[PDB]
Design a protein around this ligand. Sequence first.
Ligand SMILES: Nc1ncnc2c1ncn2[C@@H]1O[C@H](COP(=O)(O)O)[C@@H](O)[C@H]1OP(=O)(O)O
Ligand SMILES: [Cl-]
Ligand SMILES: [Cl-]
Ligand SMILES: [K+]
Ligand SMILES: [K+]
Ligand SMILES: [K+]
Ligand SMILES: [K+]
Ligand SMILES: [K+]
Ligand SMILES: [K+]
Length: 177
Amino acid sequence: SRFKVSKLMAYILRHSPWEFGLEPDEEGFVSIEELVNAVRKVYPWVTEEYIREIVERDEKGRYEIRGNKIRARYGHSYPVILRHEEDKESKVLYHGTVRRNLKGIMREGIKPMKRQYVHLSINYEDAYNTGMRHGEDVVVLIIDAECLRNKGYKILKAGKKVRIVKHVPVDCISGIL
Ligand SMILES: Nc1ncnc2c1ncn2[C@@H]1O[C@H](COP(=O)(O)O)[C@@H](O)[C@H]1OP(=O)(O)O
Ligand SMILES: [Cl-]
Ligand SMILES: [Cl-]
Ligand SMILES: [K+]
Ligand SMILES: [K+]
Ligand SMILES: [K+]
Ligand SMILES: [K+]
Ligand SMILES: [K+]
Ligand SMILES: [K+]
């Protein structure tokens, strides 16, 4: 199914490409032809046309293809430089987290998990669902994106709803939901 093959694609492209004999470049891209060969180790019926279709139909914009290169647009656990197009229009973004993190966030802002980027969403519901990954007692921070930009932080369009930024200072957090 597209779900099973996309879940593997995301694991290879975000977390363990070397296990599959792939070497990402500095921007996270691998050969899409080599990716097909890697995925066929698990799902031998997959084709390049199928992987391209998964990319086109993905509801979050998880993937990006340029020529023969494919990458995950976000969520890597290894170093990548992601020169995505800047989100210049959003005025408010959201960050889902768990209540036990409020004390540190209100002291030093939102920090990336050594991940280079903090993840935000244009939608409250998506941020809530992301926060659920770290526990049950989820809260959603309202982020003043214009304030963020004014401080010099570039906010990048990483997915259809996901936005990435280096750091969110405390004074850019306008509310808790
Ligand atoms: N259809 C999918 N294709 C690729 N990755 C997926 C898919 N659904 C969930 N994932 C990923 O599995 C992890 C667990 O997700 P969840 O908590 O929603 O179950 C997330 O990294 C999530 O990435 P993503 O944030 O892009 O959905
Ligand atoms: Cl909590
Ligand atoms: Cl999110
Ligand atoms: K490659
Ligand atoms: K094909
Ligand atoms: K998908
Ligand atoms: K990648
Ligand atoms: K979030
Ligand atoms: K920006």
